[PDB]
Design a protein around this motif. Structure first.
Motif, PDB file in Angstrom:
ATOM      1  N   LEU A 231       0.687  -1.267  -0.009  1.00  0.00           N
ATOM      2  CA  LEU A 231       0.043  -0.196  -0.031  1.00  0.00           C
ATOM      3  C   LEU A 231       0.965   1.326  -0.204  1.00  0.00           C
ATOM      4  N   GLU A 232       0.226   2.427   0.111  1.00  0.00           N
ATOM      5  CA  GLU A 232       0.735   3.682   0.127  1.00  0.00           C
ATOM      6  C   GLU A 232       1.918   3.908   1.108  1.00  0.00           C
ATOM      7  N   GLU A 233       1.532   3.373   2.461  1.00  0.00           N
ATOM      8  CA  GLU A 233       2.626   3.836   3.629  1.00  0.00           C
ATOM      9  C   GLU A 233       3.591   2.489   3.388  1.00  0.00           C
ATOM     10  N   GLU A 234       3.420   1.147   3.049  1.00  0.00           N
ATOM     11  CA  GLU A 234       4.331   0.377   2.829  1.00  0.00           C
ATOM     12  C   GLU A 234       5.377   0.876   1.965  1.00  0.00           C
ATOM     13  N   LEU A 235       4.920   1.495   0.904  1.00  0.00           N
ATOM     14  CA  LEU A 235       5.756   2.039  -0.322  1.00  0.00           C
ATOM     15  C   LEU A 235       6.543   3.035   0.124  1.00  0.00           C
ATOM     16  N   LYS A 236       5.948   3.999   0.939  1.00  0.00           N
ATOM     17  CA  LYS A 236       6.537   5.256   1.319  1.00  0.00           C
ATOM     18  C   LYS A 236       7.869   5.072   2.230  1.00  0.00           C
ATOM     19  N   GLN A 237       7.345   4.268   3.269  1.00  0.00           N
ATOM     20  CA  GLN A 237       8.347   3.860   4.234  1.00  0.00           C
ATOM     21  C   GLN A 237       9.583   2.986   3.913  1.00  0.00           C
ATOM     22  N   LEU A 238       9.095   1.958   2.936  1.00  0.00           N
ATOM     23  CA  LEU A 238      10.369   1.071   2.455  1.00  0.00           C
ATOM     24  C   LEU A 238      11.279   2.085   1.584  1.00  0.00           C
ATOM     25  N   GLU A 239      10.496   2.918   0.591  1.00  0.00           N
ATOM     26  CA  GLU A 239      11.299   3.754  -0.067  1.00  0.00           C
ATOM     27  C   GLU A 239      12.333   4.661   0.766  1.00  0.00           C
ATOM     28  N   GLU A 240      11.777   4.961   1.925  1.00  0.00           N
ATOM     29  CA  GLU A 240      12.722   6.030   2.871  1.00  0.00           C
ATOM     30  C   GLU A 240      14.113   4.881   3.378  1.00  0.00           C
ATOM     31  N   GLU A 241      13.610   3.716   3.618  1.00  0.00           N
ATOM     32  CA  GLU A 241      14.665   2.894   3.972  1.00  0.00           C
ATOM     33  C   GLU A 241      15.809   2.583   2.865  1.00  0.00           C
ATOM     34  N   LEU A 242      15.279   2.421   1.860  1.00  0.00           N
ATOM     35  CA  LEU A 242      15.929   2.002   0.665  1.00  0.00           C
ATOM     36  C   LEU A 242      17.059   3.587   0.332  1.00  0.00           C
ATOM     37  N   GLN A 243      16.417   4.489   0.507  1.00  0.00           N
ATOM     38  CA  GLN A 243      17.266   5.927   0.576  1.00  0.00           C
ATOM     39  C   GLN A 243      18.351   6.043   1.312  1.00  0.00           C
ATOM     40  N   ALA A 244      18.121   5.469   2.666  1.00  0.00           N
ATOM     41  CA  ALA A 244      19.158   5.492   3.659  1.00  0.00           C
ATOM     42  C   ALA A 244      20.330   4.435   3.462  1.00  0.00           C
ATOM     43  N   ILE A 245      19.968   3.172   2.956  1.00  0.00           N
ATOM     44  CA  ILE A 245      21.172   2.391   2.300  1.00  0.00           C
ATOM     45  C   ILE A 245      21.656   2.861   1.080  1.00  0.00           C
ATOM     46  N   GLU A 246      20.908   3.820   0.232  1.00  0.00           N
ATOM     47  CA  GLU A 246      21.781   4.276  -0.915  1.00  0.00           C
ATOM     48  C   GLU A 246      22.785   5.305  -0.465  1.00  0.00           C
ATOM     49  N   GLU A 247      22.263   6.294   0.524  1.00  0.00           N
ATOM     50  CA  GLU A 247      23.282   7.208   0.799  1.00  0.00           C
ATOM     51  C   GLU A 247      24.460   6.680   1.660  1.00  0.00           C
ATOM     52  N   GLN A 248      24.543   5.535   2.162  1.00  0.00           N
ATOM     53  CA  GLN A 248      25.625   4.838   2.747  1.00  0.00           C
ATOM     54  C   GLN A 248      26.398   4.180   1.706  1.00  0.00           C
ATOM     55  N   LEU A 249      25.676   3.758   0.653  1.00  0.00           N
ATOM     56  CA  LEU A 249      26.506   3.092  -0.399  1.00  0.00           C
ATOM     57  C   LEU A 249      27.042   4.134  -1.399  1.00  0.00           C
ATOM     58  N   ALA A 250      26.564   5.192  -1.464  1.00  0.00           N
ATOM     59  CA  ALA A 250      27.261   6.334  -2.141  1.00  0.00           C
ATOM     60  C   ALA A 250      28.500   6.643  -1.383  1.00  0.00           C
ATOM     61  N   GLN A 251      28.455   6.721  -0.098  1.00  0.00           N
ATOM     62  CA  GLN A 251      29.341   7.288   0.790  1.00  0.00           C
ATOM     63  C   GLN A 251      30.611   6.236   0.459  1.00  0.00           C
ATOM     64  N   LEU A 252      30.441   4.875   0.424  1.00  0.00           N
ATOM     65  CA  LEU A 252      31.428   3.979  -0.021  1.00  0.00           C
ATOM     66  C   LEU A 252      31.995   3.964  -1.061  1.00  0.00           C
ATOM     67  N   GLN A 253      31.257   4.383  -1.999  1.00  0.00           N
ATOM     68  CA  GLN A 253      31.694   4.507  -3.740  1.00  0.00           C
ATOM     69  C   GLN A 253      32.640   5.754  -3.707  1.00  0.00           C
ATOM     70  N   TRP A 254      32.626   6.753  -2.839  1.00  0.00           N
ATOM     71  CA  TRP A 254      33.253   7.759  -2.787  1.00  0.00           C
ATOM     72  C   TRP A 254      34.559   7.450  -2.080  1.00  0.00           C
ATOM     73  N   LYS A 255      34.597   6.666  -1.090  1.00  0.00           N
ATOM     74  CA  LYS A 255      35.830   6.230  -0.266  1.00  0.00           C
ATOM     75  C   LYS A 255      36.662   5.232  -1.072  1.00  0.00           C
ATOM     76  N   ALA A 256      35.742   4.233  -1.840  1.00  0.00           N
ATOM     77  CA  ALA A 256      36.597   3.351  -2.595  1.00  0.00           C
ATOM     78  C   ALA A 256      37.329   3.842  -3.988  1.00  0.00           C
ATOM     79  N   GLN A 257      36.653   4.919  -4.712  1.00  0.00           N
ATOM     80  CA  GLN A 257      37.275   5.578  -5.775  1.00  0.00           C
ATOM     81  C   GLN A 257      38.439   6.463  -5.296  1.00  0.00           C
ATOM     82  N   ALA A 258      38.340   7.061  -4.257  1.00  0.00           N
ATOM     83  CA  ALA A 258      39.353   7.755  -3.654  1.00  0.00           C
ATOM     84  C   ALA A 258      40.606   7.197  -3.724  1.00  0.00           C
TER      85      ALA A 258
END
Lengths: 40, 120, 40, 120
Positions: free
Chosen positions: C1-28
């Motif tokens: 539903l609406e709330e399941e999609l919205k909340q899971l999207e938020e949790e995905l975006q938190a993982i994606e923020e950490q992922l980008a951080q590691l990409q930055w560190k790895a490329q450096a």
């Protein structure tokens, strides 16, 4: 030098292991979001 | 409320192969994904490979690319790791893992020892 | 539903923020390894 | 032995822009990269953008793509964040960071408040 390159490579590979772990977790949730989208 | 049980470890010569399995049982279980981690004494568990539960999309760390293959069967809630071309540096306790929620912690099994030792 | 999609999207975006951080560190670090390679 | 000092925060209407700066000084300093993080009350700092020091390669989180731009100047040991198209949900304390070693911890500054509030 030799040791600087070898050690920094090891530290890079540790970050890369964590990176792959997060990629796995992120893709798994993307797939769940797609499945919920189909239920609507 | 879910238990994870590995199998398939052992002792091989360099160049050998092993197939690890892991079955999840207990309360009804539908994880985001399952995966394999490894650990040497005095160090933390490190990621080895993962598979997404719905799509079956696979991920591998660079040190096992082209040598290890992960797969899963939803009907039996089981994940597998086929480990080929084994090297002494692959020696570790291999642990099975389930990504089940958003706490940041996975559910784990009890580990299976994998030893790759050159005897001669 | 609406709330399941919205909340899971938020949790995905938190993982994606950490992922980008590691990409930055790895490329450096990859760039540092390349630079050390040129010194040899 | 290195100190990081931010500037450029403030209060804008939705749609406005701000430019954050951060200068590193002290002992001679050659990090792997620098970056920007943000924090709201009661939550941990979250990554916003990073740039590699040697190559200048940039990384952005999905919520700021196409709105924020990071850059750096090695001559002055300074990193910048140009923040356009600001939204109320961008309101946070923005922190500057330096990736300096392999401890897993970055060096940080003291933060600059960014408030995006719709007044009318």
């Amino acid at each position: 030098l030799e040791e600087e390159l070898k050690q920094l490579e090891e530290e890079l590979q540790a970050i890369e292991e964590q990176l792959a772990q997060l990629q796995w977790k992120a893709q798994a949730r993307k797939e769940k979001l797609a499945q919920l989208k189909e239920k609507l | 409320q879910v238990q994870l049980q590995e199998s398939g470890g052992g002792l091989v010569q360099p160049g050998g192969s092993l197939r690890l399995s892991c079955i999840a049982s207990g309360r009804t279980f539908n994880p985001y994904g399952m995966g394999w981690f490894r650990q040497v004494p005095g160090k933390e568990r490190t990621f080895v490979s993962g598979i997404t539960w719905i799509g079956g999309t696979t991920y591998y760390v660079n040190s096992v690319k082209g040598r290890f293959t992960i797969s899963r069967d939803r009907a039996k809630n089981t994940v597998y790791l086929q480990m080929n071309s084994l090297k002494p540096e692959d020696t570790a306790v291999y642990y099975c893992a389930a990504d089940k929620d958003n706490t940041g912690y996975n559910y784990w099994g009890q580990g299976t020892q994998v030893t790759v030792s050159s005897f001669g």
